[PDB]
Symmetry: C2
Subunit: 481 residues, 2 copies
């Protein structure tokens, strides 16, 4: 009965990059066709616009500050990770008899002997990199075949990037141009095996596209009309087409729910090798709309009618929506998301009315930075980010320091999705929204306790993964292509 | 059964002016002796530190913004006044059979044909001035006998100040040096008449001391050791001694509850002819402690034991406390005060935990300026005032513009009653108080609707009281000494 679920999650992909979201030069045919036969969201969000906190909110349905996933992101030597008491979507579904698998980027911790890796958090199978593909030296890696080097060199002084098969190093570093093929092969096996055992599968595909540095296989190099950022987006798009064909071939089209979203806004610091937030303001690292609002598509033939919704939805609602769909019971913890099945099935409206946004570096004195309720969004604090540097808007830059706003900056997103015109710079409708927004912020700030910081547990270079354990000299000896 | 109640309310009198509150040169023997045989409050407050809003909160037990008593104060030509639907303490007690009377300053409105004057708000008898004694020309009035003129001239272009007997002009202007004697005579008659009819009395004595310009009868001129401000405080003090003697003479000491407080902090703009907030900061016109915290004494032999309380109390609690004491039922409206009888009778604690402070000029976008809960006080907005000009502290001056604080300025008043050291300039106790304070402000701001402004209804010079109605030329012809 339960449907097969495929969750595709891109990296550093903006609201404005898909062809079907208006980009003028992107090449995204498979995703455009998924949009045309399914539900496209205009108002779907993540609560925090950084890699780690966003992946944690997705898998647990819980605001990242509750389990210490702040500040910033995790690094290869981090001691901390997503606590093992947290229940993930993979576990909710595993206990209901799903065969669960994950391909790609984890970024939720490695820890002493890989205690925080995926196999310990409900995934039966796992093929991927445990953090971002730029958190290790890349001046000698090939990003585009036959021999175009990755640009800029990535993070120095670390072990090369490891490709893992569950808990074992399969390659270090992997060959970037062939990663996609590896991941499609893995996905195909997971599907077929689940079919054979008469059980539903759950595929978590956490792509490295479109994070820096850009790369692709040889079928896409110089073929998109948007340079390296495009080639890489085009490969991600072809991966979606490949998964849809594999779902075709096995006669599972009407029994599989396919969801596509992305973790956080574009890193405009990469300039034309980085994403695009379209009409929205600023990008990764900020609580402006270009940082937190992402593309989101839902496709399930004969169940989800083709259309466009403007209803409020969050990555936080994915656990409870998927549980409900699979007839799995919810964990016994406070959750911050809701079941969106009525909306998906067209029998009801989204139950979500409000959204809460935390910054990259949160603190308990300040609390939530921005809150949206209906079409209104208030900003109590504003701050630019180096990840959103280089565009013409000065509020996006790292030089825009942390600034308090009281009364808050107040925008009507139905008319000013670009956050250009502060309404408080009077009306009874506005005043009532203002008072609601202020009370929602004070209620959440008083009820939420911050879990102890995982990131502040520190770093220990002995925690880096090494293909040749015991090796010397570290870290350059750790390798095995 | 119900006790006789005498409520003495001074004008522009600071926390630091009574001898029993530490002043080094004031002469206040009767009040010091009342303090020595009764209850002295260290933490008693008014919600707004201006004449009109404070008198409204006292008589109704309701925050002044609910019935439009803002912004600023009322003037002789004001069209507005305290709405007649509001229920006052005088009415609560009149309906329980009290013989009620008021001597002194009203400042709650005059209106077309004196519709807002005291006789329409539950007082049986009324002898006094309908607004402050400086809201009319005083360059020719004698402030101190035999012929010392009032200093500075007061407000120009208006009708002289009227002394009224219910709704009729008894004199215009009155002779300042003999006002006290008039008021004591009136008080004595009210007491005796109530005794004779076997009924309890309620005397509301709203003194003009110690508002500018200072004045006194001849027994006090140049006799205090603190100049004109002192002479005037000394007369107010002798008035209290006279009322206590009159209560003695009629054998009513153990059957009468006597309360003394003041409406708002000192006007330091008058320099050494103005009051003193002692250790507290700033004065009239501000939401700093020297503006809102006043002297307060309760005396009732054989019922209230002599002592000092630090418990929280407000002018807002006087209606409900007096109702309860007289066995009178409370009006059917939302009240913002509580019954303090247990505290007064020494059988319980004050039920009040929090206090809310509004500025002279409030608005619905900003809401409450400052909130106190337990020993903590947060300031969300700060602002100086011309009424608090001339001292060495720059935050008190009119040049200190309206400033938002987020996070708020946070003080521990048990250790820093002077509001000098911001705690947020960390601890778990502090953080919990912070979150409580923020939530209390957002709850009150969301629940309180501002009543339509009475003061903004405008002015009409035809509303000025005239001893010779029809007169010309106005306003100088209006007079009758
Ligand atoms: C690591 O672990 C999984 C299982 O723990 C490995 O896979 C299994 O895959 C083969 C066929 O592909 C089956 O015969 C087994 O039954 C599978 N087990 C389960 C529980 O599914 C796999 O080689 C590794 N994960 C991947 C795909 O890298
Ligand atoms: C105006 O009104 C009151 C009454 O409305 C006047 O006073 C009364 O006072 C005399 C004795 O002083 C009594 O004989 C009457 O019974 C009183 N009436 C009440 C209801 O108390 C008074 O002259 C005026 N008020 C004052 C004192 O100025
Ligand atoms: Mg990312
Ligand atoms: Mg006053």
């Amino acid at each position: 009965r339960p449907p097969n679920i495929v969750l595709i999650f891109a990296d550093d992909l903006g609201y404005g990059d898909l062809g079907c979201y208006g980009h003028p030069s992107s090449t995204t045919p498979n995703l455009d066709q998924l949009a045309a036969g399914g539900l496209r969201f205009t108002d779907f969000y993540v609560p925090v616009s950084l890699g780690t906190p966003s992946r944690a909110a997705l898998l647990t349905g819980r605001l990242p500050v509750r389990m210490g996933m702040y500040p910033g992101v995790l690094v290869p030597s981090s001691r901390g990770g997503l606590p093992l008491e947290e229940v993930t979507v993979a576990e909710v579904l595993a206990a209901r008899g799903y065969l669960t698998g994950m391909a790609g980027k984890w970024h939720l911790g490695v820890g002493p002997e890989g205690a925080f890796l995926p196999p310990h958090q409900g995934f039966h199978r796992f093929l991927g990199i445990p953090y971002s593909h730029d958190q290790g030296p890349c001046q000698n890696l090939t990003c585009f075949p036959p021999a175009t080097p990755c640009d800029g060199g990535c993070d120095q002084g670390l072990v090369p990037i490891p490709l893992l098969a569950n808990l074992s190093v399969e390659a270090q570093p992997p060959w970037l141009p062939g990663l996609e093929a590896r991941y499609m092969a893995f996905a195909h096996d997971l599907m077929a095996d689940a079919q054979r055992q008469d059980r539903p599968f759950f595929l978590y595909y956490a792509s490295h596209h479109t994070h820096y540095p850009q790369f692709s296989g040889q079928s896409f190099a110089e073929r998109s009309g948007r340079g390296p950022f495009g080639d890489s987006l085009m490969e991600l798009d072809a991966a979606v087409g490949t998964l849809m064909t594999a779902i075709g071939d096995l006669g599972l089209l009407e029994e599989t729910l396919v969801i596509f979203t992305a973790d956080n806004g574009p890193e405009t610091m990469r300039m034309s090798r980085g994403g695009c937030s379209g009409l929205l303001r600023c990008g990764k690292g900020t609580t402006y709309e270009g940082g937190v609002r992402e593309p989101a598509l839902a496709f399930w033939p004969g169940h989800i009618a083709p259309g466009v919704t403007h209803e409020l939805a969050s990555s936080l609602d994915l656990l409870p929506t998927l549980a409900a769909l699979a007839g799995a019971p919810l964990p016994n913890v406070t959750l911050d998301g809701f079941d969106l099945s009525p909306l998906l099935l067209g029998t009801g409206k989204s139950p979500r009315q409000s959204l809460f946004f935390y910054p990259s570096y949160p603190d308990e004195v300040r609390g939530v930075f921005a809150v949206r309720t209906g079409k209104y969004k208030a900003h109590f604090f504003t701050q630019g980010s180096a990840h959103s540097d280089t565009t013409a808007d000065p509020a996006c830059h790292a030089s825009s320091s942390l600034t308090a706003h009281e009364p808050p900056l107040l925008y009507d997103l139905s008319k000013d999705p670009g956050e250009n015109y502060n309404l408080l710079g009077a009306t009874p409708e506005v005043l009532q929204a203002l008072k609601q927004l202020q009370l929602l912020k004070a209620q959440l700030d008083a009820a939420v306790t911050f879990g102890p910081s995982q990131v502040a547990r520190g770093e220990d270079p002995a925690l880096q993964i090494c293909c040749h354990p015991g090796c010397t000299p570290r870290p350059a000896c750790c390798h095995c292509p």
